[PDB]
């Protein structure tokens with residue numbers, strides 16, 4: 001049973017209660033239910049809570065359902081709205097679906113099972129469209145970096161292009177590349193930042209975990225994906241440390257050269273926690289692998305000079 | 308009215324079937340040709356022989372239960388999803404729920420159907436199958452690209468990398484033949500690796516040494532410009548190329564230049580040998596991306612040469 005936020009927008013307190021009772025009868029999910037009796041507040045709750053689905057009464061005191069959809073501006077998001085219409089007004093349902101709704105229900109004909117089916121579909125379909133959009137953007141990033149590696153030997157340009165595009169794609173506060181010194185200490189080679197996190201470049205913090213251990217887990221590929229340093233169960237030493245650079249969410253991907261650990265591709269969220277998705281993690285492993293190709297390429301260019 | 312959609316209705320009631328067809332008339336947006344079957348066996352035959360855009364399936368047929376039917380449906384490999392809409396009697400929603408886990412896209416309740424609801428349900432099933440297809444292909448091409456990147460990162464033998472590109476590309480594309488063309492210093496050319504299917508007679512061991520097009524007619528190939536022929540007889544080609552292509556039984560031709568540094572190293576070639584083929588953007592962009600990776604692969608092998 002996963003969690004779902006469902007927003008009900010209907011001016012009849014009883015219908016809201018009816019729908020609320022119906023959604024609880026769903027074994028597949030646990031629903032957090034938000035309510036509004038007016039369109040304007042519906043819009044406000046929508047904008048503040050990003051609910052997974054919206055049950056929308058076509059006839060509200062302030063807005064008709066069509067006006068509500070038109071007052072919605074949504075990356076490139078899709079609206080998980082189910083229009084609720086009265087029997088006989090199906091023509092509204094059709095023009096609502098052409099305006100962005102995912103499905104509709106007939107008020108007096110609604111059953112719990114039908115409600116589940118509607119919510120499932122609106123959510124699944126928006127998820128498909130969201131995933132497809134993410135696949136397209138993720139492909140642009142990978143191809144753009146592939147392009148760079150084919151067009152140049154220089155690291156400063158490839159790493160830079162990498163750091164920027166991932167920050168753009170992920171909408172992260174910070175992305176940078178951390179490089180290990182021979183004495184297993186670290187420095188930030190490149191960076192790209194949003195002004196919500198206290199900088200790290202030029203202000204170097206000395207950790208003792210990489211000098212002492214050398215990162216054998218990172219050599220053999222270990223990645224860390226911390227959604228929120230306060231709920232992941234880290235030690236008090238680590239939590240307090242990250243709080244001083246305002247890192248709230250942490251994603252770290254090792255960069256490998258030869259059979260050795262060259263450095264780290266690092267993503268930060270500094271304002272709020274962030275649950276890193278499988279697609280995003282997979283993107284970074286891939287880029288890191290391309291960086292390995294770049295580094296290797298640059299070293300073969302160094303070796304070829306000396307000859 | 309020109310028919311835009313083919314719908315297969317599988318239901319043992321001739322009256323309900325005609326009823327649904329009339330409902331479909333109320334959709335001004337589309338024109339429906341309806342195939343009808345009263346039995347599972349005939350439904351399956353009609354499905355397999357005529358490839359309808361969507362299916363309305365009665366959960367209870369005289370010979371097969373709706374679930375048993377879905378299990379006998381095999382979908383083409385370029386559209387692996389079943390655009391089936393289950394029709395169940397009320398109270399039997401639970402059977403329909405198990406159908407959507409078995410591949411149906413949606414369901415309807417027998418006595419509750421309205422013309423608009425039928426339209427939207429058919430609309431939805433076709434759009435969702437299309438979304439699911441697009442997402443499915445994005446995942447496959449990313450795997451292909453990610454697999455070649457890995458190989459390059461591992462510094463594996465290039466001919467093995469070339470092999471992998473050639474094989475995996477033909478599978479993803481359902482193409483009759485894919486191969487890699489390599490230029491000799493004297494601007495001729497030979498076929499290094501290949502992947503060929505039923506409809507196509509192979510070309511690899513009988514390579515004709517072509518003229519110096521790379522100097523003037525590969526002006527575009529040096530500058531990275533690709534050729535994408537849907538049908539060699541309508542592309543406006545000269546007799547020499549047309550006759551040449553016909554001697555290899557090429558009907559559709561997609562060729563992508565392979566670059567090493569900024570020089571024309573060779574060509575990635577895709578062929579359809581049976582029928583003409585309109586090459587789609589996803590397919591072309593995949594090929595360009597692979598072409599660039601082979602370019603990066605070629606660079607890795609040359610840099611290891613002096614060293």
Ligand SMILES: CCC1=C(C)/C(=C\C2=NC(=C\c3[nH]c(/C=C4\NC(=O)[C@H](C)[C@H]4CC)c(C)c3CCC(=O)O)/C(CCC(=O)O)=C2C)NC1=O
Nearest residue numbers: 200203204205206207208209224237238241245250252266
């Ligand atoms: C933001 C700027 C910055 C950081 C984060 C940095 C050090 C830093 N310490 C790290 C990990 C670490 N550092 C420590 C711990 C310590 N290190 C010590 O010097 C202590 C003795 C000790 C506890 C006080 C630990 C426990 C980790 C995490 C190790 C793990 O991954 O399990 C990491 C990698 C994981 C991460 O990014 O969270 C870095 C980059 N230096 C910097 O300039």
Ligand SMILES: CCC1=C(C)/C(=C\C2=NC(=C\c3[nH]c(/C=C4\NC(=O)[C@H](C)[C@H]4CC)c(C)c3CCC(=O)O)/C(CCC(=O)O)=C2C)NC1=O
Nearest residue numbers: 488510513514515516517518520524525547548555560562
């Ligand atoms: C097994 C397959 C095979 C081929 C396809 C090959 C030759 C071959 N000739 C090509 C182009 C070409 N080849 C020719 C012309 C000629 N070529 C000649 O051998 C002529 C004597 C001459 C006719 C006058 C032309 C005009 C092109 C296309 C140039 C362009 O469109 O840029 C191409 C690349 C473009 C394409 O195929 O569309 C190849 C690979 N040798 C092979 O073993």
Ligand SMILES: [Mg+2]
Nearest residue numbers: 011057059060
């Ligand atoms: Mg109302």
Ligand SMILES: [Mg+2]
Nearest residue numbers: 103104118428
């Ligand atoms: Mg429905």
Ligand SMILES: [Mg+2]
Nearest residue numbers: 121122413431
């Ligand atoms: Mg649906």
Ligand SMILES: [Mg+2]
Nearest residue numbers: 318319320365
């Ligand atoms: Mg029947």
